[PDB]
Amino acid sequence: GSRRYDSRTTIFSPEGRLYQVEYALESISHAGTAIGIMASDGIVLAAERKVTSTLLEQDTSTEKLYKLNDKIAVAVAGLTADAEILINTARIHAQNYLKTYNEDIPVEILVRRLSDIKQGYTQHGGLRPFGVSFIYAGYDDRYGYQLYTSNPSGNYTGWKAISVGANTSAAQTLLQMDYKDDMKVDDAIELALKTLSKTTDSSALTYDRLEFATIRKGANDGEVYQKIFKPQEIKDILVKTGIT
Amino acid sequence: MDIILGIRVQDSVILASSKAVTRGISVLKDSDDKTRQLSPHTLMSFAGEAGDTVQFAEYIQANIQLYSIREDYELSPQAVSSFVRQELAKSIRSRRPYQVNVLIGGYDKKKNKPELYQIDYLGTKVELPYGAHGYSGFYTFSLLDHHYRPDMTTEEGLDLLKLCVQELEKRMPMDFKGVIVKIVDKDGIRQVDDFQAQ
Amino acid sequence: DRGVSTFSPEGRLFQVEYSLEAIKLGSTAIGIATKEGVVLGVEKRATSPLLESDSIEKIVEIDRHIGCAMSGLTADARSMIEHARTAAVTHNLYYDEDINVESLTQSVCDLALRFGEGASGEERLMSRPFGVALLIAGHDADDGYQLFHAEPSGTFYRYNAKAIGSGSEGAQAELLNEWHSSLTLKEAELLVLKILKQVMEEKLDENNAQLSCITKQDGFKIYDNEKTAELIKELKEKEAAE
Amino acid sequence: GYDRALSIFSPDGHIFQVEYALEAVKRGTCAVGVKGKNCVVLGCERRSTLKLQDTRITPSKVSKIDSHVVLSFSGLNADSRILIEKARVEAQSHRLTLEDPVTVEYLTRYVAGVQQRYTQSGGVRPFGVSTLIAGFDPRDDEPKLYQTEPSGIYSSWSAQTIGRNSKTVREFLEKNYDRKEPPATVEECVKLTVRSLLEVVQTGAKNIEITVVKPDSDIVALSSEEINQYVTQIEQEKQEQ
Amino acid sequence: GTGYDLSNSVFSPDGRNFQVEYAVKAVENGTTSIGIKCNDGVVFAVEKLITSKLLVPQKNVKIQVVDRHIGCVYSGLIPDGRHLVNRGREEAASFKKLYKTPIPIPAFADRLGQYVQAHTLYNSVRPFGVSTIFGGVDKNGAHLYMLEPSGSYWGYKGAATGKGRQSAKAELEKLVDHHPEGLSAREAVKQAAKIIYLAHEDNKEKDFELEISWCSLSETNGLHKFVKGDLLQEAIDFAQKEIN
Amino acid sequence: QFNPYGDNGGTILGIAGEDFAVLAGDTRNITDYSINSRYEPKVFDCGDNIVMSANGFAADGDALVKRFKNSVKWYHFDHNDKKLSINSAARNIQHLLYGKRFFPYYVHTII
Amino acid sequence: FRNNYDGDTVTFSPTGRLFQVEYALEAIKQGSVTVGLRSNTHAVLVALKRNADELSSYQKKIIKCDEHMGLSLAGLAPDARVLSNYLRQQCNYSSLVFNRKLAVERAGHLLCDKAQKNTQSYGGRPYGVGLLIIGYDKSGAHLLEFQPSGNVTELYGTAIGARSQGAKTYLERTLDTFIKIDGNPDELIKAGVEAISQSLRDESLTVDNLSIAIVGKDTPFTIYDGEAVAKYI
Amino acid sequence: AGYDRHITIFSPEGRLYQVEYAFKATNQTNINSLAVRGKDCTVVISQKKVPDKLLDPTTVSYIFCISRTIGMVVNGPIPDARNAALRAKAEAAEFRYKYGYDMPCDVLAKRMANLSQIYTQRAYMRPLGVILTFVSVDEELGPSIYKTDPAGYYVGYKATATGPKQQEITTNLENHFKKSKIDHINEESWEKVVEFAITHMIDALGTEFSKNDLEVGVATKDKFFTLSAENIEERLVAIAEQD
Amino acid sequence: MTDRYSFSLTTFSPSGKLGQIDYALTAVKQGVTSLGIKATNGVVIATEKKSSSPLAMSETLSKVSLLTPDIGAVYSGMGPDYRVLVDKSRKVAHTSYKRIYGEYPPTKLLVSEVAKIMQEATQSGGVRPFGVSLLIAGHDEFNGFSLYQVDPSGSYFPWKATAIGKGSVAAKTFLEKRWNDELELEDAIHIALLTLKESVEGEFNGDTIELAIIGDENPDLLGYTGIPTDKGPRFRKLTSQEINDRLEAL
């Protein structure tokens, strides 16, 4: 029959571990490093582009930083195609909530729902898990600026500063070293770039290998603004922070 | 139909609901509470089809209570009313629609302002300083168009409702056996046990 | 791998046979049928002194005239009890009468082989057999007092006395000698208490052991700890007598 | 579509997938529950593999099923949410039909039933979660504490612990809990809870969280200071000897 | 490597389907049965091994009728043969319902052919453990067919399958050569009876029972009928005479 | 438009004695103003000492008696040849009749 | 060899065998002995009932399908319950739709076709029980032997189960005698009891151990157990 | 791991062995077939081998009439051949019903190739061990030869060959077209195009044919038909009066 | 019967690799070289028509396919896999866009739709990933000209210029030397023919080469007149003659 060829993706190891989850996490540990840092006046998302060429169009490119809501954005580490599947369902869930309650979806509710979908592929279906780790950057009028992270297991946690993908151990040590509770966005932007510049597997940290986004409540407005940095804007901030 | 009245004052929303339940020839009950508490600061009154009326109310109540526990948070009166509207908007195009008209009176703790929502069985939601369902509105709206101010105190609002009930007791054909009056403010929902002769 | 409804070269069902091994590890349950009623007794077997012993529910009521005891994977028995309770009440609704004990047992046993990954016979949606054996005991007007042993195999036997669980083979050999067609209810109660004491790892008291009976007059009743304690005291005295 | 029998019997009469689900519980952070004369207390340890979390938003270990019932767990966090959600839905459904909130036994029986179902259904693995369910029955003041496990087996405890080093903390509780005189105060109940956790947590003011459930929907979680005060007093009991 | 013979629909490195070839081994192990196409019809005959005296003679019928004009006989796993005839009957009824005319023999042949071939396409089903000899009279003459476990079938002058298929085929070949003008329905019944007795020598240890059926335009009005009584005994004697 | 129901007339009678019971019924079967049969049995022996007649629409009457007779047969199969008591037979028929609550057996039935 | 080709019923062996079917056939040989035999007026089932303990009951071996048909089992009892219940429906359907008693030969065809479906599809398993069907229809007395392989054979007499060969040899010898026991039920039953006792070894057939059924000309299928078989021991 | 050769999943080399072994099944019948285009016709020749004397040779065929206009010759086992034939017929009839015109040869080829591609991707469906050569005189493209394989591959041919000795026939035809400089057989009658096909069938295989060794199907404007033994005999007489 | 393969055939290995995707990429690597270059006023996609027989008609096999009147696609790897993807891509352009918004999808979104189809073949039960890499070139009003590469994993990235298949490594290197942000469409076609020559072993002409462009609107290829807003398709496949003319200026 068919049983012969069944990998059994949703079974426990003798130790009580989920094979496919563990192996999916191993897959992500090779993907470009993504960093999120939450400050008092906003949040910073930074991501290192894995594999680039001279002929790679960076202006029309987006592989790690995606807009879910007007208040919620994500940083991606792992399979881009798997991530886009989950991103689309998350974008729909946000709109379902807005249509139902006439209010924007609270960050955790959206995060939990995506994490629950990931958990599903972990317990039933016989399908492989999504080889994706998300860093959620979002704002709502309950908890303010929030930073979440989710992995193939379907587990999510909140952070002041976090990294996913490659060299997370080295990145987390550097973040835990220089992070302070009273930080400003501009300080966080710098911390994010410094941490990446030291964890990079490449020679130098150039603009063409980076994606940058900040979620700030521009004082001269009163509303939350999402800013996905353009190639030139990344090039500028890279010089100012003293990396050139 | 049963009498369903609502009035938003300065710091509270007051709901007045008739106590009578009539089936055909007989008045079966004269102490019926035509309301449900969806959350500590949100109250919903209802009138309509015999079975649908309570069934819909308890169904909505269950969903808001489930949300409250899941999030450890109370939805704003606007968010609850938008949820109720969508439920009725689904219902109207189903096999057997809920024939229930509702008034949602809630105090928004975030805005620190009272709110009153009127939604009919079709899913027609509107926010009002004062609202009524059925034939009640035909006598009451002109009364309230005349005597209503937005700065009125809760006591002024109770005097204003008394004036509405008196008009409904004079000109209405049905004996609705008086009303149960409830106040929704910053401190939650309480029942005025003394409206039989206030 | 290998199918869940695969035959062994000996003509046995692997999963059914392995299921019987799970029951062998379960807590001991003894049933004794008399012309005065059927007695059911179980070993509570608490895993820790902090475990509140009275929360161990291994003897359950199916109907006023039918009760049962479980041994093995006790969690598997819940849906079986649910099915039994429904089958009993449903029969009463359809026929204005009590369901025969044998008919109730057969209905429970009908679920047993309803396992597989797609066995061509009906829609057997259950990944494995039950990991629990049942001692269904009751009374009806047609066949009087009865004791049945329901297995995950689907087969059920009627016993005058039966022991299931860890100390089954030893307790069964004891029941073999001790049982006779003229036993009284009290004789059976003490006899369950005596044989449980023999096979139990712990010293039998009114906390790690539970008694119950089914009589035509009062139906199925679970003995409260105070009632059992006296029967234990009565048993110790009669043993020390000779 | 997928109905492959994952939880099956082995030659020795074991269901390895249920057995390995318990190993996931052994891996999970320690959780403890003790019932007093007028309250139940739930204690949970906090991991330290990574420290830089946001404690405000990070999902807490003790969850409210209803206003009167709480659920703590040990094992896979992702799996626990599915159990909590289903329990929370059943809580409201029971109130809607019976017109009376769930008893702690009933809520436990339901959660255990869901867990058991996943041990003999096609195409699903068992929950790698054991739970502690505590609270007070409607209009009742007698404390309730129950434990469930991947197999679907449940039972009530005077005091119980699950997770990593639950073996150690249970021993403490077995020789520190008297059924004759259960902690007759909320204070001495929380003290016995923190004491039992300190046997394993190894100096953890921020690594220990406590929740107190009293009769009539009176549930409150203790702050770091309130707990840290207990730790300070307990460390003195040792040094004063 | 190996293991190409464990699943049904798998091709082996030499383009074979081993499970089908394994099904043939079950056919070869079975009783011998034949089919003789005559000038205006077809004759079917089968060996019936008398296991013991307890078998009620003439009761355990093997030859089956499809519709009212088709006769089917098979060697191998008898239950599988019944399953195929059950399908063949449904298939014939479906044809008659829509087209009014009873199903033509070549039409009916393909209907069984496609159905048997279908059981070689998936690993969830087992190939048929029978070779079926069938045929009858339609709009334009008589037809004889033999169907293999592979789904393969052809039109035949004479057909044979089972234990003594070689002895039968040898006798069938002699008849084709010595009768280029065509055998008669009467003669084919006698000749079928002989071929069975001669092919029984590959199983001469156990006693057997003869069973003959025929479908002739002149003799049976083009309807399938069993050979019984005097005509059966006449054929039994014709064989018992030429066996010595 | 097609009317699934008809009226075959007839009348049935049941009287219970102290240790006996009778179930009578005329053998006339009709349609409008014509007689279909002068002898068409209406009262039946269903086994287990139970007599039954479902008078009204004959097609519904026959279908009900047939289904009850088959219910008695399966009662023996499922319950070790136990005798179906008259009280049990009645309750069984209630479920047979209420089973078609929204497309009723157009009959007055007496056992 | 065998180990690679006995995982499921959907697999043929290199020799063309179905081991899962053969394994199911082995469950019959492990089952308790039962005997069928017929004349021209009657058909008799004699079955040896097996008990677990001396405290247990002797599990029933004979099931009634209709007023004119019934069967005896050897192997898995729940599978015999499934197949007998299917046969009960087929006899029932024939009566309700056609006002016609189901022919014993046709009943055998239906059991054959149902057993076959469990021998060709994945996920399923062959039935683990042998059946001996007796019946009196429009063509007289009948006896059928059902095998899980799907093979159904009409016989004058036969036996299935453990040591069944003893009874089968006796009947093959007593053939000319019992076939003529017409109009005498007691003698046909005695001939069956003498048949079944040729398969004994452990004990001797007792009162609560013997099970006999009969059907015929003016005899509806009736089962005799206990006190009712005492006059045959 | 080693099951990458049992079902249609990629091997480490990026290969699909089940598709490759399905290709091997196409030669099981030991039959060679060729197709050539005339001026306004298309001719298929296929070897006919009837070993058993008990066979009715009139029923032994690997050429199928799919529609009034389309004909198909198969290389591979007959059960898979008839599976592909019935499907092609069903697809041809449906297309006409839905779209109001006769399904073109190249479209049926693509449709059958797409179906074959699905068995290449889906695990539960095995590839058919056959190669299908479709022929017709399309109302838009004229004489057409389109051939599909177990891989799901298909393409149009000026002429083609299939079977064990495919390469010998292919190179033979190649050399003729290198010489003639045209992509067809410049002949007005189909009879001579059939004769051409038989002639080069003989030259490439080095074997003489009787009337029962061959099998011919001819596609013309608005009709595809197969030749009888005597129609072929007439063709064999004509080629003999040249050599 | 019934597809009982409801489980994934692509799963994570201990190393974190997705075997079937890696092997699908290996199958791509064996495939014939195809390329794409983006100019300032157009995009060019080209491949070699590897005729598997001289008796076969290479015209009846298009390796370059039109998806929408402004979007074209080329591949490297398994031909049959590409063909069915083209059919699905053409349909999804209608069902998921044109039937809703009354206009053809922008290049990036159709690429995203194709990527989704290929992604699902990586996760869905009882299937293998597509053994192809695609190069999709298109134009839309708000994004201008763009070129994308879609891999078996479902991952897609935009390019200024790139090559896939056999000699991709060597071809990409040559493109890096010749590409600039000021290239005219004709210059890109010239570079395309140069890069492809190094990949072709045998005959190199308009019959062995398949080349198409995404440039200006072609009102002569529209099929009708009378609607001013409809100015024709931007996708145009170059004729065998049009290629040879540019090969003389090689």
Side-chain angles (χ1 to χ4, degrees), chain C residues 39-56:
Chain C
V39 178
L40 257 43
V42 295
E43 169 190 14
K44 249 92 170 293
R45 191 194 280 177
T47 53
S48 172
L50 290 166
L51 187 281
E52 299 181 7
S53 68
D54 51 7
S55 68
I56 299 171

mmCIF file of all heavy atoms in Angstrom, chain C residues 39-56:
data_model
loop_
_atom_site.group_PDB
_atom_site.id
_atom_site.type_symbol
_atom_site.label_atom_id
_atom_site.label_comp_id
_atom_site.label_asym_id
_atom_site.label_seq_id
_atom_site.Cartn_x
_atom_site.Cartn_y
_atom_site.Cartn_z
ATOM 1 N N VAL C 39 -21.219 -9.354 42.785
ATOM 2 C CA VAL C 39 -20.298 -8.445 43.468
ATOM 3 C C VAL C 39 -19.118 -8.083 42.566
ATOM 4 O O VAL C 39 -18.502 -8.959 41.958
ATOM 5 C CB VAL C 39 -19.778 -9.049 44.796
ATOM 6 C CG1 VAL C 39 -18.789 -8.113 45.478
ATOM 7 C CG2 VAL C 39 -20.934 -9.359 45.735
ATOM 8 N N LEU C 40 -18.822 -6.788 42.484
ATOM 9 C CA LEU C 40 -17.665 -6.286 41.745
ATOM 10 C C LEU C 40 -16.689 -5.565 42.668
ATOM 11 O O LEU C 40 -17.080 -4.672 43.424
ATOM 12 C CB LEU C 40 -18.109 -5.355 40.612
ATOM 13 C CG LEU C 40 -18.119 -5.861 39.166
ATOM 14 C CD1 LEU C 40 -18.682 -7.268 39.032
ATOM 15 C CD2 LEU C 40 -18.887 -4.891 38.284
ATOM 16 N N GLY C 41 -15.422 -5.963 42.601
ATOM 17 C CA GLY C 41 -14.372 -5.356 43.414
ATOM 18 C C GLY C 41 -13.138 -5.022 42.604
ATOM 19 O O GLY C 41 -12.731 -5.797 41.736
ATOM 20 N N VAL C 42 -12.543 -3.866 42.886
ATOM 21 C CA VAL C 42 -11.337 -3.421 42.181
ATOM 22 C C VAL C 42 -10.212 -2.996 43.124
ATOM 23 O O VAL C 42 -10.448 -2.642 44.282
ATOM 24 C CB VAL C 42 -11.615 -2.262 41.188
ATOM 25 C CG1 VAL C 42 -12.524 -2.716 40.055
ATOM 26 C CG2 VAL C 42 -12.186 -1.040 41.901
ATOM 27 N N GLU C 43 -8.990 -3.045 42.601
ATOM 28 C CA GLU C 43 -7.825 -2.482 43.261
ATOM 29 C C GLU C 43 -7.662 -1.045 42.774
ATOM 30 O O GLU C 43 -7.438 -0.813 41.584
ATOM 31 C CB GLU C 43 -6.583 -3.318 42.926
ATOM 32 C CG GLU C 43 -5.250 -2.698 43.324
ATOM 33 C CD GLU C 43 -4.053 -3.441 42.750
ATOM 34 O OE1 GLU C 43 -4.233 -4.280 41.840
ATOM 35 O OE2 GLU C 43 -2.921 -3.181 43.211
ATOM 36 N N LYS C 44 -7.802 -0.086 43.690
ATOM 37 C CA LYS C 44 -7.622 1.331 43.361
ATOM 38 C C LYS C 44 -6.233 1.603 42.791
ATOM 39 O O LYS C 44 -6.104 2.180 41.709
ATOM 40 C CB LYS C 44 -7.866 2.222 44.585
ATOM 41 C CG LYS C 44 -9.113 3.089 44.512
ATOM 42 C CD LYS C 44 -10.334 2.423 45.126
ATOM 43 C CE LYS C 44 -11.482 3.413 45.257
ATOM 44 N NZ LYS C 44 -11.209 4.491 46.249
ATOM 45 N N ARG C 45 -5.208 1.169 43.528
ATOM 46 C CA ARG C 45 -3.802 1.342 43.152
ATOM 47 C C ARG C 45 -3.451 2.803 42.845
ATOM 48 O O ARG C 45 -3.268 3.188 41.686
ATOM 49 C CB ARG C 45 -3.421 0.413 41.987
ATOM 50 C CG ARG C 45 -1.927 0.330 41.707
ATOM 51 C CD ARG C 45 -1.647 -0.305 40.355
ATOM 52 N NE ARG C 45 -1.730 -1.763 40.403
ATOM 53 C CZ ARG C 45 -1.578 -2.564 39.352
ATOM 54 N NH1 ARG C 45 -1.335 -2.060 38.147
ATOM 55 N NH2 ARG C 45 -1.672 -3.878 39.505
ATOM 56 N N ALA C 46 -3.380 3.613 43.899
ATOM 57 C CA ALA C 46 -2.935 4.998 43.783
ATOM 58 C C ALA C 46 -1.425 5.025 43.581
ATOM 59 O O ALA C 46 -0.692 4.264 44.218
ATOM 60 C CB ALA C 46 -3.327 5.789 45.021
ATOM 61 N N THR C 47 -0.964 5.900 42.690
ATOM 62 C CA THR C 47 0.458 5.974 42.339
ATOM 63 C C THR C 47 1.282 6.802 43.331
ATOM 64 O O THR C 47 2.515 6.794 43.281
ATOM 65 C CB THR C 47 0.667 6.512 40.906
ATOM 66 O OG1 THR C 47 -0.020 7.760 40.753
ATOM 67 C CG2 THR C 47 0.144 5.517 39.874
ATOM 68 N N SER C 48 0.592 7.504 44.230
ATOM 69 C CA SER C 48 1.227 8.353 45.240
ATOM 70 C C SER C 48 0.260 8.616 46.403
ATOM 71 O O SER C 48 -0.949 8.713 46.184
ATOM 72 C CB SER C 48 1.680 9.676 44.610
ATOM 73 O OG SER C 48 2.132 10.602 45.585
ATOM 74 N N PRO C 49 0.787 8.722 47.642
ATOM 75 C CA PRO C 49 -0.041 9.025 48.820
ATOM 76 C C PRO C 49 -0.794 10.356 48.729
ATOM 77 O O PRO C 49 -1.794 10.544 49.426
ATOM 78 C CB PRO C 49 0.978 9.074 49.969
ATOM 79 C CG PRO C 49 2.314 9.202 49.316
ATOM 80 C CD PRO C 49 2.182 8.451 48.029
ATOM 81 N N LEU C 50 -0.317 11.262 47.878
ATOM 82 C CA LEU C 50 -0.960 12.559 47.670
ATOM 83 C C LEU C 50 -2.190 12.467 46.764
ATOM 84 O O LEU C 50 -3.010 13.388 46.724
ATOM 85 C CB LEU C 50 0.041 13.574 47.108
ATOM 86 C CG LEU C 50 1.152 14.083 48.033
ATOM 87 C CD1 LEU C 50 2.221 14.801 47.225
ATOM 88 C CD2 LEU C 50 0.605 14.992 49.126
ATOM 89 N N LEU C 51 -2.310 11.354 46.042
ATOM 90 C CA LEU C 51 -3.463 11.094 45.183
ATOM 91 C C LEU C 51 -4.688 10.763 46.029
ATOM 92 O O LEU C 51 -4.666 9.820 46.825
ATOM 93 C CB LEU C 51 -3.153 9.951 44.203
ATOM 94 C CG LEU C 51 -4.119 9.563 43.072
ATOM 95 C CD1 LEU C 51 -5.289 8.721 43.562
ATOM 96 C CD2 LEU C 51 -4.617 10.788 42.326
ATOM 97 N N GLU C 52 -5.749 11.550 45.860
ATOM 98 C CA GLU C 52 -7.001 11.337 46.586
ATOM 99 C C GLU C 52 -7.702 10.087 46.054
ATOM 100 O O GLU C 52 -8.280 10.099 44.965
ATOM 101 C CB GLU C 52 -7.900 12.576 46.502
ATOM 102 C CG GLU C 52 -7.281 13.829 47.115
ATOM 103 C CD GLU C 52 -8.183 15.051 47.050
ATOM 104 O OE1 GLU C 52 -9.358 14.925 46.645
ATOM 105 O OE2 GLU C 52 -7.709 16.149 47.410
ATOM 106 N N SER C 53 -7.633 9.014 46.842
ATOM 107 C CA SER C 53 -8.020 7.663 46.410
ATOM 108 C C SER C 53 -9.460 7.510 45.924
ATOM 109 O O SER C 53 -9.739 6.677 45.059
ATOM 110 C CB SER C 53 -7.743 6.652 47.526
ATOM 111 O OG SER C 53 -8.601 6.864 48.635
ATOM 112 N N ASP C 54 -10.367 8.309 46.483
ATOM 113 C CA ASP C 54 -11.789 8.242 46.129
ATOM 114 C C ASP C 54 -12.109 8.799 44.735
ATOM 115 O O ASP C 54 -13.210 8.591 44.219
ATOM 116 C CB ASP C 54 -12.658 8.917 47.205
ATOM 117 C CG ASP C 54 -12.186 10.322 47.564
ATOM 118 O OD1 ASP C 54 -11.265 10.856 46.907
ATOM 119 O OD2 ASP C 54 -12.745 10.898 48.521
ATOM 120 N N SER C 55 -11.145 9.493 44.132
ATOM 121 C CA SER C 55 -11.293 10.009 42.770
ATOM 122 C C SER C 55 -11.005 8.941 41.712
ATOM 123 O O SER C 55 -11.279 9.147 40.527
ATOM 124 C CB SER C 55 -10.406 11.238 42.549
ATOM 125 O OG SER C 55 -9.031 10.897 42.565
ATOM 126 N N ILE C 56 -10.446 7.811 42.144
ATOM 127 C CA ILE C 56 -10.229 6.668 41.258
ATOM 128 C C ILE C 56 -11.566 5.975 41.001
ATOM 129 O O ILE C 56 -12.144 5.350 41.896
ATOM 130 C CB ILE C 56 -9.193 5.669 41.824
ATOM 131 C CG1 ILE C 56 -7.830 6.348 42.008
ATOM 132 C CG2 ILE C 56 -9.064 4.454 40.912
ATOM 133 C CD1 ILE C 56 -6.810 5.514 42.759
#
